[PDB]
């Protein structure tokens, strides 16, 4: 073990959950989703029909991920250094935004249907991380012939967590399997097989291009569903809690441009398709939270100040950072 480098020991929470409505936020950490395959960003196909029916969803059309892989992007999304000073080999030892929120009294939960938190949860008690790739945590793993656990299974029993933390601020990270490839056709149940035909081979260049895109977009439909149902779960708590939902993908995906597939390329020569990511923010009416303009130039650096603002926490390190949400309030 090494000593922790601190970045926000000055951080303070301006209001406590016993003097105002406690706050409950779900942060969906996306996976392999491309911004240009989002309907709201101009994509021909309606890949997010369920989010289109929900009032108060803001789509952000200019979000660039810090990196092109899970191991690189996820720690930086929760970091105080920002991507320009970020070092993947020492991120584990920096105080991160979840450290700050937990220290100030916010109850943190991380459910993972992807891999793990890439070190972000390492300083917090183990019980606050849960592996939802296990079929004895996730009840939604036998709905497909692959025995693949589904992201929506992370919504089961969250009410037990809320009841165990009654009256406290809560931040729940849900780490998606999402659009992980190359086997996009495995990422969704049959109810989302909307675009056909579908590539079902493991070698992407060998399938016809339209079938690969169809499987990718079908996987997006399952993500649209997962985000929509996350909002619907939050809405059941809106009387007692100020509820909000943030979605950001960790990186994009190449889909055959210049013969390139998948992601994970070094930033120095990675194509833009691996960095252009969707971002969504939803909040209930009573929260008093105001989103930034949909065309704000944004990066993963916006995530940490957003989470801090959602819980009324000020940190000097990120005082000049742009977030997904505004600081003015209209009564
Ligand atoms: Zn990833």
UniProtKB/Swiss-Prot annotation:
Q: Which domain of life is it from?
A: Bacteria
MF GO annotations: phosphotransferase activity, phosphate group as acceptor
- Residues involved in Zn(2+) binding: 31, 70, 250-251
Q: Which GO terms describe its biological process?
A: lipopolysaccharide core region biosynthetic process; response to antibiotic
Listed A to Z, the keywords are:
Antibiotic resistance, Cell inner membrane, Cell membrane, Disulfide bond, Membrane, Metal-binding, Phosphoprotein, Plasmid, Transferase, Transmembrane, Transmembrane helix, Zinc
Q: Which Gene Ontology cellular-component terms appear in the entry?
A: plasma membrane
Effect caused by changing residue 180 to A: Abolishes transfer of phosphoethanolamine (PEA) to a lipid A analog in vitro. Almost abolishes resistance of E.coli strains Rosetta or TOP10 to colistin and polymyxin B, by comparison with the same strain expressing wild-type mcr-1
Q: How is its activity regulated?
A: EDTA may inhibit activity. May be inhibited by ethanolamine.
List cystine links.
66-76, 141-149, 199-207
Spell out which residues are annotated as carrying Phosphothreonine. Answer: 70
Report the EC number(s), separated by commas if there are several: 2.7.8.43
Periplasmic domain ranges by topology: 1-326
The miscellaneous comment for this protein is: This is the first (November 2015) reported plasmid-mediated resistance to polymyxin antibiotics; although it does not confer a high MIC it protects against colistin treatment in a mouse infection model. Colistin is one of the last-resort antibiotics available for multidrug-resistant Gram-negative bacteria such as K.pneumoniae, P.aeruginosa and Acinetobacter. First identified from a pig farm in Shanghai, China in July 2013, retrospective screening detects the gene in (slowly) increasing proportions between 2011 and 2015 from pigs and chickens, and also in hospitalized patients in China.
Q: Into which family does the record put it?
A: Belongs to the phosphoethanolamine transferase family.
Give the protein name, as stated in the record: Phosphatidylethanolamine transferase Mcr-1
Q: What is the originating organism of this protein?
A: Escherichia coli
From the broadest rank down, the organism's phylogenetic lineage runs: Bacteria, Pseudomonadati, Pseudomonadota, Gammaproteobacteria, Enterobacterales
Fragment boundaries within the full protein?
Answer: 216 to 541 of 541
